[PDB]
Design a protein around this ligand. Structure first.
Ligand SMILES: Cc1cc2nc3c(=O)[nH]c(=O)[nH]c3[n+](C[C@@H](O)[C@@H](O)[C@@H](O)COP(=O)(O)O)c2cc1C=O
Ligand SMILES: Cc1cc2nc3c(=O)[nH]c(=O)[nH]c3[n+](C[C@@H](O)[C@@H](O)[C@@H](O)COP(=O)(O)O)c2cc1C=O
Ligand SMILES: Cc1cc2nc3c(=O)[nH]c(=O)[nH]c3[n+](C[C@@H](O)[C@@H](O)[C@@H](O)COP(=O)(O)O)c2cc1C=O
Ligand SMILES: Cc1cc2nc3c(=O)[nH]c(=O)[nH]c3[n+](C[C@@H](O)[C@@H](O)[C@@H](O)COP(=O)(O)O)c2cc1C=O
Lengths: 252, 252, 252, 252
């Protein structure tokens, strides 16, 4: 039994009407008919601390960053979901700042599975739902899906479904009748079908890759110091792949 | 028996030394040990016409665009390869212009399989090898992999492997000793192992998605006209998702 | 007398050591020698509410979004600064989420000057300081500077200065000795000199553009409805600039 | 007397109808009324060699890259134009491959003015005209304008004007009636007015920045070697700005 987790990263608290929620409302029943259990979280309804602290930071400065919040609750849902769908409005040609905080904190997991020697989100599947007034879906898809791929998510074809109006200021999905927009509706159906299939596949046949084994082989064929000479005698910023400055010989 | 096709999109003809080729030289024997037959094409060595023509263009203007070239030969290799690896230098925070032409022409296939009702590059797998002097790998990964995902490629985790120096003008992979660069070497191993596994998986268990069926369902729940009113009384470009201008009623 | 405002958008509260602060520490005395008064704000030290509310949202949901915070104080500094420098670490190939919130709220100003009929941040100048462990400076520069340009900032050449290490996980500017990194140091000097000159220029000779006049002329040559027919009979997502579906005739 | 040069980077030869040309047709008379002499070049009509050669490449391989073509003619127009407007369709969420080749070759100028000690395209002004069927204008604006800023162009506010339809496959500007699209028409007017003003300003009051002087000061405060230790004992790719590996001591 697979679980999809859909994160609506709108900046507006429930029950304020969300343009992005309209795409989510299409995807949820399609996943259920795939036999996939689905949960929708509007992350901005939850207290997720944005500030950062670790042991290299100042202890007292980090007090707020270390406080109790709802991130462990959300992180556990992400860890248990086989399909993660970020459902984000577009803001500044990016995902929202709320999606941004979530991904920042998700990228703090410095663990390795057991057992498999894989990053903890390996064998999961990502899709995207995006809503903008005019522009930015493909740019946001590239950025978010690239980052989720680094975490261990696989991405099927046609995994990013979205609504946009024409060049202009709006209006959004609701006044623009996005729920009857053919292109968006077909993309959502593509996404659900492809993410569902890939998730079933990877649940049966997960990656067997041993990342520690890959890294040990890489260590045997690599140096543990990076060093290059720099031409400090020019204002030029033009790229020069060959500069013939000589190699750097490092101590001991 | 699976085939990987690696496209070196350097701007320099063979046998000029390519910085990017160094990453390719790591990946090729790793794929062979996976039991995967690999071919490397340096696309700039081949005559691929950049100009565009179709029936809406002017006939005589399109003569050069319609000429005989090596694109059918390259396209057939792409169609038969189960794994496509774009191996691109970074240029202007983008892939090279040679990669750009290839992807432009690849995006002209307006066909649907048989049979499966899928885009013709469905069930294939993409990875990336990238080389830059300082910056741009993740940006290029997002853009290229998003576009290949729209064509039907699936992307495993950690599918983009790359080399970059620090902020500066260079030098590149060769003078910078990228062949002994631990991070690049481990990323290449991650990519080969994950793309190989996903390609074997999809060869055994391809997507069953029927895109025509998805589109017919989308047609039943959608309009065949998009129409919104525009506020023509303001210089503002600030986004307004609600503008309360009223719906547009369309003829017949 | 011109003012530069430099916003350090690190996620860590003062006095935690910030890698990005090192670039700021170079820029501040260079601006002073230009005769420019400079202020550094670490925005995460201040209470800036992320949630959104306006009159189309639910009143009670918006209570937290409407609360008293430090945004008016920060916004007034931005309005009075002739040079805005966003000094951002790189996170997820983007600016930080803290920079993201600031820009989101900055993009909510729906006002027009007086008087000049220009957006309120017209005639100001933007630069960027960026710090990453390996990659993303140019991508972030494009996204942030494009967005600030839409708000009214002008951008001189070589306005984005940054530090990055090579492909890898780190370390950052401090352990990587970025303060003695020639390329970063020269870029910072370029940025300060060019932003200072452009700000002095625009203070003496501001844009005279009348955006209302531009919009009224655009209204006279434009429609107040956007409408196109859609081909609802295909799964294809391939772009077709000509589809010969016929024009849409709109009521009255 | 100032000159604007507008480069239509469509992939289709004249006289094939270009969607992007429609935006150019709006901008050209607006520049003339500003008293600015304007020239439109459709770059794909001209023979511009894409392959690269320099002295580090193989001599015989580089023969085609070194051949006589129309690039010197185009480069001289770029050097003499005070305003450069790239007018590009959107392809793969990027500018076209033809724009890409032009910018690649433009980025090969490794010269410094005289005299001013500035990059040769200093004191010029850039704007953008973009046309897409649905999505990508802001992403392309960020990438292209960032790159032109590195070359010496200044960018005024609201310098990128564009047309896009809603999410979908098309049609383009012509069938979509982009010539009567209010938002695009007002953005073009903004761009012309702001680029014209900034170009007049910089012709009267150019940057006085001495980039050689900036670089010499940067040399005095910097090292001529970049060197960091690498942790070769982990598969992790999570970013760690502090790794406490110790500094690298370099020979002599
Ligand atoms: C600060 C800001 C920036 C925006 N940037 C963009 C953009 O870069 N591209 C777009 O197509 N739309 C945009 N929009 C508009 C749009 O994305 C957003 O209003 C809409 O999708 C909201 O969906 P939601 O109800 O929250 O679920 C921006 C809106 C704002 C402020 O609310
Ligand atoms: C026109 C141009 C733009 C470049 N832009 C970039 C860039 O935006 N980011 C980088 O890290 N390196 C870059 N580089 C340098 C770098 O990518 C490239 O030289 C190197 O990888 C070549 O590899 P190759 O031998 O062809 O296989 C740019 C180089 C040029 C000209 O050759
Ligand atoms: C969640 C996350 C994402 C990061 N993404 C990136 C990235 O995409 N590209 C980079 O070069 N460095 C990156 N880094 C590392 C880097 O930008 C950042 O640690 C460093 O500049 C901090 O500067 P600061 O002390 O806050 O002023 C990411 C770091 C984190 C977590 O702290
Ligand atoms: C290969 C390809 C990729 C495209 N990618 C995009 C895209 O990523 N975003 C868009 O809005 N439109 C796009 N389009 C469509 C669009 O940009 C283009 O057809 C239109 O502007 C042409 O203008 P022109 O007549 O040449 O001056 C892509 C079109 C093609 C093939 O012709």
């Amino acid at each position: 039994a697979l679980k999809a987790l859909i994160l609506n990263t709108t900046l507006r608290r429930s029950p304020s009407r969300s343009q992005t929620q309209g795409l989510i409302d299409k995807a949820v029943p399609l996943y259920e008919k795939e036999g996939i259990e689905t949960e929708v979280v509007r992350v901005i309804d939850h207290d997720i601390e944005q500030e950062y602290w670790d042991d290299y930071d100042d202890w007292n400065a980090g007090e707020k960053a270390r406080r109790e919040d709802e991130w462990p609750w959300l992180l556990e849902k992400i860890r248990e979901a086989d399909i993660l769908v970020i459902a984000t409005p577009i803001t500044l040609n990016m995902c929202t700042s709320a999606a941004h905080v979530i991904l920042e904190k998700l990228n703090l997991m410095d663990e390795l599975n057991g057992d498999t020697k894989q990053f903890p989100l390996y064998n999961k599947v990502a899709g995207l739902l995006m809503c903008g007034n005019e522009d930015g879906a493909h740019h946001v898809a590239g950025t978010v899906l690239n980052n989720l791929g680094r975490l261990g998510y696989s991405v099927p074809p046609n995994a990013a479904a979205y609504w946009l109006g024409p060049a202009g200021t709006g209006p959004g999905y609701i006044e623009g009748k996005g729920d009857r927009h053919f292109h968006t509706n077909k993309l959502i159906r593509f996404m659900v079908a492809n993410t569902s299939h890939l998730a079933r596949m990877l649940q049966e046949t997960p990656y067997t890759t041993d990342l520690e084994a890959c890294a040990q082989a890489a260590r045997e064929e690599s140096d543990d110091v990076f060093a290059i000479r720099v031409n400090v005698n020019t204002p030029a910023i033009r790229y020069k792949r060959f500069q013939k400055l000589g190699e750097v010989k490092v101590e001991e």
